[model samples]
Target: QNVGTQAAEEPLNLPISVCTAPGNCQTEADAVVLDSNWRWAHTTTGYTNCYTGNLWDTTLCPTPETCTTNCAIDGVPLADWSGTYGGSVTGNKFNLKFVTVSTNIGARTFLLDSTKTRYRMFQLLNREFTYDVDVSSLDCGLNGALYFVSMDADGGAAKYPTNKGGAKYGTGYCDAQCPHDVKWINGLANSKDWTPIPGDANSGKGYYGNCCAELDIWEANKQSQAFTTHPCTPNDQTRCEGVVCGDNDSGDRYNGMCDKDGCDFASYRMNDHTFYGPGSTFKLDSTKPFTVVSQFITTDGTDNGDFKEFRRFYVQNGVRIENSKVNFPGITAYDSITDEMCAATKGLFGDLDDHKNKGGMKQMGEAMRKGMALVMSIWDDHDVNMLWLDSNYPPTGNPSTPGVARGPCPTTSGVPSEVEVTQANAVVSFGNIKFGPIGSTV
Candidate 1:
């Protein structure tokens, strides 16, 4: 077999080396497929401007950032945001905040120890993934977790209180996963002292005590599971089950319990420990920019050391009634990271404007036409104080709950427009971002 390079004059009738950079395909069909995938892969990496500084090798940065327009995990630019606030007494990741204040909820003193893990959550103000998400520039040709800090306006924290030798009631290795035992059905806004547990700094008069409360096996058993409105049922009560905080309002998963009023039920003790809410269910709004205030990471009791924060952003540009573009000869697409044309943009800031100070521009945001789409991406998923927005444009799926419908992304459009589609009854479109194979580095 003569597996050698062939000349342009020679017909490719035999097996030969195929150099596939560009201009290699002569047929329109093969060219189209490659063009689509190449652009998609290019977009998958989030418009990276340079291959310099190692070109995504494993020897340099362990988990290099990935960027792309396809909204795939491998080709998305992700940010890391983790900061702290309130000094000695309060802390948080990114702008997600929680401060213990005078209250009549549950307890007044939150306990922080080697066992507490900070958490954050976000609720989308609108639907997302109506357009194709491209973050090609951020990909470092490696697999890493998307990191970002989640901000909470309510300023609360969850707990994993350890029993400190009868210092207070419900205090004793009180199941490290989640010490505060509050349920969503209990109305996070509700406050009550554990009269069952004696002793309190201020008669234990805590407001929103249940806001950051955790449930113990005994306390949880006394009730008939959380009411039906509970976000998720606490199926596992045993600490030994290796469950972490998640969908179940149970402390096992890093989730917060919400009362019918939407108040977070995780309780916090003031001036003692910082309260962080849920981690997984948190959502961010893309219509505007949210800035991070402060963050704290700890591997050594106090200090954000080599950990990561995972964050995601959701943005819906709108439905596509027509295809529009610039007056120039080429095409254009709407960019959130950069507000201008994608080709002329520079820096990791991309093109999106920072709305933290001046707020989002209604002119720019409204300029998005029906041909636009809602985009989702991994803002950050690192272990330390790093922030990343959703790099991929697709949503996992449409919200099963009605009134949570997503519009369709534009399938064909000119410059400043996008090439995307919608699924799930056109309610949402899932980004093609995946963690494996896409960014494989040799």
Candidate 2:
């Protein structure tokens, strides 16, 4: 496996000045002195106002009026960091309180710092996540997810190890590791085109998006939208060609438009073979709090002596529902560039292609071994009607084509009775976020 070096950019404004105590890491200067135990942050002005010290702002509102109702971080009291968190860090377990509704673009506070020297890359040898979520009040169109991310080659190996190869200063798009998210889709009974119809959408062709099965529905009227759209470029689809990105020899790179054949940004997802959505096993109950756990394990030489790393998701105590390596219809590979040739030629890294020389689970295994930051977020996908949550009427399609479909956007013209946005006080809670060798518990 290859390792890269951390970038030389200025670090994030940390709240402390010393590493003498847990939850406190040494910074370059003695600048700010905010409360150390406070991990939750909010914004009373707008959705995007919170930064650094402002991340701990405590202004609160008992009830919110609209989706843009000034949001804040909600969770268990954060403790100092030390050895054995759950089993590794010493103080308290990591937690995230998914509070009231924010814009579709809103996200949970990202605590994992991306500075070169701040956070270290700890390999995901063995770890599990436990949380309690209350979704009884969430309306249709709102979505949530648990994921991880790493800096791509765009920033010259910003935070990865130095030993790894293929470190380019400015090439592919920055941020977001491919195939790194697991989503929760919440739909209501009054939701437009939310459930699946038996055969076709009048056009005779099967639905291209997820079709809801009775089993996939949680409450009598609620449905889950559980799928991944890596490089989910609804805004840039014409440039990207389709749901996926550019082909070889034409797409462009980085911040530039997709005039060429290079797809600088690549992403994908995994799911069960029998169902398009998350299926019955992963459904969330609004009345009760649910727990989610993910395990990263090494597979024996089932292919070519490559001890490829694989991931699995489980709910309902310990029932394993989804495994990347074992399940079908999952995203097999992801590329930072158009072709895997970039990695082979050492032009740039971030290729998870299973067909190339260093492809398949081998590539994913290599990336995971490098270590990543844990991330959890809740938002709306109303920007693109690709996922059913963004629409009210069924999409247009021709039975002659397999994956061909268009939109009946969730607007005044779409389904007037259904809501295109989220409800008030939509929340999710995460607790006992333990990370350690397999089997470690709090």
Candidate 3:
């Protein structure tokens, strides 16, 4: 399964399957088995480096940035990307931009795509992938993320709004279709918002929304379940009330309504909330380099009839943190606080769990049959003015104190002109970025 010539020299006993020809693995039957490897020829022509701190727009940084050669750390090449796959780099490392425009705030994304539009979808059922990152030198930015999204067969859009352009809530993307996201977030991105909530206790303190690494499973098809408009502030979180799923309302669960087929939906997390919250010892240091490995495995087949599970691990310096003992909850309990603010409504079909166990499970299987693309980027929160990032206290406490103005806040000054972001010289690097069939150890 080791396709790369250097596979024997790798320190880890990793295995992979390599494709001998250009179109050898077009279908599941032709794809390599678990733990096998495959290669595609690199087709990217060149890289386009956008001007730093520019407003995010398709026209601004338009080219698909990618590197044809294998990636490495400090010249120590780790994995091979010599084939059709490539990654974009700004300066010496992969860059996630910072901008002043609200729509562009969290818009700097580095996407990896296969040269062929109709390539086979990588199976997540029983698969693992790892990437190394060094953010110790990163400064001036609020947060950073490493994750993936589902895409159409032709390398087009699937569920999440992150990869699409539409006019749903305004000029941005909406996640009405429940795209899946497995992410590693650090820096101030984990900081809470400071926006004040009338009855909420964590309003003033910025710790209200500190999110680290987590597995998010979103649902789609419920018209009223989507966000109706752009949420520009913490108080406006309800603008998209019924348009999306995973808000913790029992009504959001698979019944016949939201998902006519009744899919088994769940989510898991290891962060500063519940167990790792405010005082937990699993925190990430922004001043040092860190590595995060994530894996999503299925209990059975690759078809819609499969059941999936998510897992994550973190390592900083030479220390590592793996809480495999923790039993995380599903979408049923993931982010239900907002549901308390609105009324609960069931789907037209009925509760998914009520039908035979196969109903919800099969529904979920169908959604993820398509392959997902890898995405990494950094940006600020403009819609809610990042109330969670500004304050550390809950609404029940006295008015939250706002963080020092590194850039603009949502004031009446006609949307502040200047924005805060990583230093002009900051760089976020990635290495050992590989994905293959799940090994027993994963």
Candidate 4:
């Protein structure tokens, strides 16, 4: 077995001195102090915003009376990440309704791949998702199709990992002695000290894993949208048929345009598999694959702003972060240059002095609402739709030491938190995105 650590807060080498009036401060020596009161308030804001979604499980209630009880429907019971069988349609469209079993209430709708285990990837066009959406009945017509595959480990890596290595060269990061420091930790003799366990990472080859799953969205030959008819596993298709409503890819990484080879950003992107806990625990060594198929381009050009946006969504939302060794390098300027498009556009990520966050939780909730609205606005523009699970990792430029102790990884010393207890939620609507409310329903 290998070791790793979770993502931790990085050191900001260049001082983030918040200055208001600028003239005498021309040379950096006279830079103003980021008011102590404002700093305190900002700290509170960050702590409240961060602890709510990332560190703590949103499902657990404050008190028994406050706890929202989950009532089972039909023969099936509600689970934390449960989604109901909404419905499906042709032309690359799908519809589903998900409800949180707890007092926290919210709604989520997404198009799934053939397996229904994971979601598709989509992007925003002109502030809204450029797709066809029928609000009355939640039908989607997106550009390219996206699919997520289960790199199941109940039987080992050979099953799904083999298919992902298709024809092309995909050097994965989840292998033995994984070079990235973000996945390793120390002191905690128990297995809980890490983030992405090595032996089980990368489809268990002890290396970076392969693609999850994605289908052809545009059936150009037939001039229609295509749905995933293939099975994620050889025998099971229940999740695929019901949860995975339809298939569609965004075709391009920028918008819905297609690349030369015609594969959407999700189709060819390499992903990593992760196991969350000890072998005895139910969530241990469980392999899940998620991809970063799109970049959230902000509305302005003030700073290299994608990180702020991505970070906000990642810390708050339940989207899975793809562990890509090559694509997303750690805290370095070189890392930023690699993803020039994402790093170039920045529009008010946050105003620390103004007690604001560039990509805070509130912003992410607003963005989701906007994304949904975008999809609705373009309801008649496309033939099908794609779905995405948003997540984030810090920029490589600000990476953590290979085996250092800091950030989100180490709680104290030898103690490790229970991994299975971590439950996250996501709801895409023009409303507050609360916790524990939308589990299993979406």
lDDT of 1 by residue, 101-160 (tens): 221111111211112211112111121111122221121111111111111111121222
| TM-score for each predicted model, relative to the true structure | 0.16, 0.40, 0.41, 0.19
Q: For residues 1-442, what per-residue lDDT tens digits would candidate 4 score against the true structure?
A: 0111221111111111112232111111110101000010001112221112112112322321121121000111122223322122232233222223322222212322222222222222112111222222112221222221222211121333322211011111111111122110111001111133232211111111112212221111001122111111111111121112221222222121111111111111112112121122312211111111222334442222331222101111234433222122442222111222122211111101110211222232232322211010111111111211111112121223221111122221111111101211211111111111111111
Index of the highest-TM-score prediction: 3
Model 3 / residue 127 / CA error / Å? 0.7
Tens digits of per-residue lDDT for model 2 on 1-442? 1111221212123221222222333342211111111222234343432212212122332222221134322222223111111101112222222232221222332233333322333354333323333344434455444443332322123332321221211111112211101110011001112222222111111111111000000111123323221221211112112222232222322222111111212111112222212234433332444444444445542222332322334344454334222112322343222233223422222323222322333443344455443334444432232234323223443412211211113333212113332333444444444444444321
Ranking by TM-score: 3, 2, 4, 1
Q: How high a TM-score does candidate 4 get?
A: 0.19
Tell me which of candidates 2 and 4 scores higher on lDDT: 2
Cα lDDT of all candidates, in order? 0.17, 0.27, 0.27, 0.18
Worst 10 residues of 2 by lDDT: 180-189
